[PDB]
Design a protein around this ligand. Structure first.
Ligand SMILES: [Mg+2]
Ligand SMILES: [Mg+2]
Ligand code: NA
Length: 166
RNA sequence: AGUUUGGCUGGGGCGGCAUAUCUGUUACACGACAACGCAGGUGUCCUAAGGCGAGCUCAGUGGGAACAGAAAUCUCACGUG
């Protein structure tokens, strides 16, 4: 069927830094730069003495991207990881992710003020017509065979660009 | 000089509060029912923790992502409470 193909729904970038000061402020500037889109902050839940954080205190910053920018951002990440992944990176849901250690490598001019950060990339894949599980009116469940499974995920990956090590 | 120096109570005293009151059970499938019977509360707190409209779904579990681990943040699914 023409609309049984697998497309990329969204790509989510997350930066999980500690503290709630200038480190968070600079990280937000870096993310909104690479994302050309306003990011949002996140607050903790519990209080942990070991991690030195309190409840509802600013910790991380993240954003989500859909469309062409999502596609090209994904390409840059795979280029940094030379289009090479591992077997234990794909979930049975039908998604996968990875992480770069230095934000310089993506092709961003280093600035001596912001510093160097690492980031997380997560990609969600699914067919067309999943809105039935998200619309306000007459919400239902997607069919089982229509759902995306893990085996089809790597096959999609190799099709666009191979290089998976089991 | 005048007067007073609580009560209940398996005698009275010391102890306790069964002295004004709320929930479950004793209580015998309407209602009502005792003991110093059992297990616990009350003399406060809130300009929002009051009023309404809208949006959302909780506890938890499983699969995934640099530092990150049993436990930090992001994502998908299940989830009659
Ligand atoms: Mg009767
Ligand atoms: Mg009765
Ligand atoms: Na007496």
């Amino acid at each position: 069927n023409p609309m049984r193909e697998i497309v990329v729904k969204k790509l989510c970038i997350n930066i999980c830094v500690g503290e709630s000061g200038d480190r968070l402020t600079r990280a937000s500037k870096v993310l909104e730069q690479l994302c050309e889109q306003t990011p949002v902050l996140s607050r903790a839940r519990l209080t942990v003495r070991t991690f030195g954080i309190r409840r509802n205190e600013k910790i991380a910053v993240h954003c989500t991207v859909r469309g062409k920018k999502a596609e090209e951002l994904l390409e840059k990440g795979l280029k940094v990881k030379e289009f090479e992944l591992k077997s234990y990176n794909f979930s049975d849901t039908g998604s996968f992710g990875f992480g770069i250690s230095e934000h310089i490598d993506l092709g961003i001019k280093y600035d001596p003020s912001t510093g160097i950060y690492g980031m997380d990339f997560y990609v969600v894949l699914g067919r067309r017509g999943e809105r039935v599980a998200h619309r306000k009116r007459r919400v239902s469940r997607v069919g089982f065979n229509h759902r995306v499974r893990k085996e089809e995920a790597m096959k999609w990956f190799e099709k666009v660009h191979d290089g998976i090590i089991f």
